[PDB]
Amino acid sequence: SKEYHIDEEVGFALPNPQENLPDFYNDWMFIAKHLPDLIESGQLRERVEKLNMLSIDHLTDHKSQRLARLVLGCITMAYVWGKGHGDVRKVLPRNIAVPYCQLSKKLELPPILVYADCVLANWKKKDPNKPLTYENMDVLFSFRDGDCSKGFFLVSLLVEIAAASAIKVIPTVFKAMQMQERDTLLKALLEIASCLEKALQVFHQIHDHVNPKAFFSVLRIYLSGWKGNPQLSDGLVYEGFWEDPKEFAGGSAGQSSVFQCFDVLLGIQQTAGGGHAAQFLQDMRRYMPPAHRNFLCSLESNPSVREFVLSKGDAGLREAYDACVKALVSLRSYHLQIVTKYILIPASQTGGTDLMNFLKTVRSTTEKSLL
Ligand code: HEM
Ligand SMILES: O[C@@H]1CCCC[C@H]1CNc1c(Br)ccc2[nH]ncc12
């Protein structure tokens, strides 16, 4: 898949993302590539204003459109938030707002940096013939020196990549149900659990490469959007595309497919019930590349793995299925311990308690799916 833009090695990540744009877009790339220096020094805004409007007709393929969305998205964060100390721009200059929106509408994504921009497309191998480890990778873009954006985006990415090993097993799960091959199904559920158990270890790198004070006080400010944000009460003006201001949520891993596809597969109904948690997760499918959205649809349309397992009186399938739910819980528990360290504690020196409660609701709903 192919039709679902899922790579066998990296899964939902864009494989081998492009680093360079056609020379026709060097004006864009000169800004995006030196944001630390241009923001700190005060030139970034003036430079986005002194930019000519450029067509998107010269972005041939998908890997190039995605790079451009990533260049334009980071530039728009830097323009809107400035040095990241509270001086806000509420108008995105038409000379950049129009191509960012035009390109966005092409990709059916919103004109704002989303998870698939700053994680899934925002990386590269150092030596392409070595393996995908932290030490052999880097990000393409950052916002400020010391904002810990490499460790944050890459460790999220390395977790996505570790989840890839399980994603490629989902076909065999539904096929084993169809063909009623109980042994094949059990082996597939235990292999899915095994890969999600391994993906926990990967999360541990977050402590080595991200510092709480930098993440809370700097990176978090540049990932923020303008949806129910008091600093832009009623959103951001995309000059020359909308006369009205438009609200768009900031980047969030609630735009991720890596856990959502296992929730869906296992019948953990994170999106049911009407609550705030399920509203957010459903609203956030809009900020997900369409092929990945479609993929979660296809999963939701398949016969329930949970129903199959429960209908069969089979302790071993029930344990294999609990092995996957448990592994999701372990990850979300580790994840909540990270949010305590990187947000709750730093803030005591979109609110802290609202975000922990969202994560707790998702965790509790994973917990409740065990047998
Ligand atoms: C410094 C490290 C991290 C912090 C502070 C952090 C914080 C958060 C917060 C506050 C949310 C709530 C949704 C939102 O506010 O957008 C969230 C959601 C989420 N984050 Fe993280 N995160 C971190 C690392 C990671 C990593 C490395 C991954 C691995 C890919 C990850 C995966 C997720 C997922 C899947 C969700 C959606 C809710 C769920 O499925 O449980 N996060 N994160
Ligand atoms: O709302 C949260 C407030 C604090 C800054 C992050 C933001 C969540 N956004 C994320 C991005 Br972008 C990339 C990877 C992620 N992993 N987990 C969350 C997450």
Curated annotation (Swiss-Prot):
Enzyme class: oxidoreductase
Principal location: cytoplasm
PROSITE patterns the record matches: IDO_1, IDO_2
Highest taxon in the source lineage: Eukaryota
Induction of its expression: By IFNG/IFN-gamma in most cells. Exogenous inflammatory stimuli induce the expression of IDO1 in antigen-presenting cells such as dendritic cells, macrophages and B-cells.
GO biological process assignments: 'de novo' NAD biosynthetic process from L-tryptophan; female pregnancy; inflammatory response; kynurenic acid biosynthetic process; L-tryptophan catabolic process; L-tryptophan catabolic process to kynurenine; multicellular organismal response to stress; negative regulation of interleukin-10 production
EC identifiers of the protein: 1.13.11.52
Mechanisms controlling activity: Activity is inhibited by and MTH-trp (methylthiohydantoin-DL-tryptophan), modestly inhibited by L-1MT (1-methyl-L-tryptophan) but not D-1MT (1-methyl-D-tryptophan).
Tissue specificity note: Expressed in mature dendritic cells located in lymphoid organs (including lymph nodes, spleen, tonsils, Peyers's patches, the gut lamina propria, and the thymic medulla), in some epithelial cells of the female genital tract, as well as in endothelial cells of term placenta and in lung parenchyma. Weakly or not expressed in most normal tissues, but mostly inducible in most tissues. Expressed in more than 50% of tumors, either by tumoral, stromal, or endothelial cells (expression in tumor is associated with a worse clinical outcome). Not overexpressed in tumor-draining lymph nodes.
Gene3D superfamilies: 1.20.58.480
Sites where the protein binds heme b: 335
General function of this protein: Catalyzes the first and rate limiting step of the catabolism of the essential amino acid tryptophan along the kynurenine pathway. Involved in the peripheral immune tolerance, contributing to maintain homeostasis by preventing autoimmunity or immunopathology that would result from uncontrolled and overreacting immune responses. Tryptophan shortage inhibits T lymphocytes division and accumulation of tryptophan catabolites induces T-cell apoptosis and differentiation of regulatory T-cells. Acts as a suppressor of anti-tumor immunity.
Additional comment: IDO1 is the target for therapy in a range of clinical settings, including cancer, chronic infections, autoimmune and allergic syndromes, and transplantation. IDO1 and IDO2 are 2 distinct enzymes which catalyze the same reaction. IDO2 affinity for tryptophan is much lower than that of IDO1. 50% of Caucasians harbor polymorphisms which abolish IDO2 enzymatic activity. IDO2 is expressed in human tumors in an inactive form: tryptophan degradation is entirely provided by IDO1 in these cells. IDO2 may play a role as a negative regulator of IDO1 by competing for heme-binding with IDO1. Low efficiency IDO2 enzymes have been conserved throughout vertebrate evolution, whereas higher efficiency IDO1 enzymes are dispensable in many lower vertebrate lineages.
Quaternary assembly: Monomer.
The protein's name in its UniProt record: Indoleamine 2,3-dioxygenase 1
Annotated organism of origin: Homo sapiens (Human)
Lineage, top ranks: Eukaryota, Metazoa, Chordata, Craniata, Vertebrata
Gene name for this UniProt entry: IDO1
